[PDB]
Amino acid sequence: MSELTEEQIAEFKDAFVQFDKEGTGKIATRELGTLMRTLGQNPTEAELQDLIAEAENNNNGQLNFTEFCGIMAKQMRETDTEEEMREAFKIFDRDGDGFISPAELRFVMINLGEKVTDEEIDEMIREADFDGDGMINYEEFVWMISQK
Ligand SMILES: [Ca+2]
Numbered sequence: 001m002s003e004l005t006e007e008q009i010a011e012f013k014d015a016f017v018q019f020d021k022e023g024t025g026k027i028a029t030r031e032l033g034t035l036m037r038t039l040g041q042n043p044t045e046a047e048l049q050d051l052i053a054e055a056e057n058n059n060n061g062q063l064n065f066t067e068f069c070g071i072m073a074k075q076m077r078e079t080d081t082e083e084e085m086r087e088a089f090k091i092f093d094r095d096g097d098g099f100i101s102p103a104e105l106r107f108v109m110i111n112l113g114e115k116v117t118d119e120e121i122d123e124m125i126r127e128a129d130f131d132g133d134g135m136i137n138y139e140e141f142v143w144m145i146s147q148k
């Protein structure tokens, strides 16, 4: 609840209880990675053991919803931001040439679940297509989603 909305808050909140349900809102750090994953951020084996032994050095071994909520919050940046971004851009491209052509953009955004019309497609492309290419570049695409 550092600076979240409420929906996400209700999320790890619901995940937290469903893991405890014993009259003590404190889950074992050894099972912390599970929640952060169920949330959106996937922790690495290494970072897990460090924060785990960490709590065991004072918090006995289990963590409270406060410290956790504080953690999921700080985890909203360990994704290297652009790293996860480039990952998605690649998904639409399909090839990985650095630019998503109409066929690549529509085919992926439509196959996932968004039934977009060609007209809307030409709109997004043209707006970000600064290089004036028949394709969107990571820079152009990322820009578009950074507002729209
Ligand atoms: Ca491509």
Ligand SMILES: [Ca+2]
Pocket: 099, 128, 129, 130, 131, 132, 133, 134, 135, 136, 137, 140
């Ligand atoms: Ca372009």
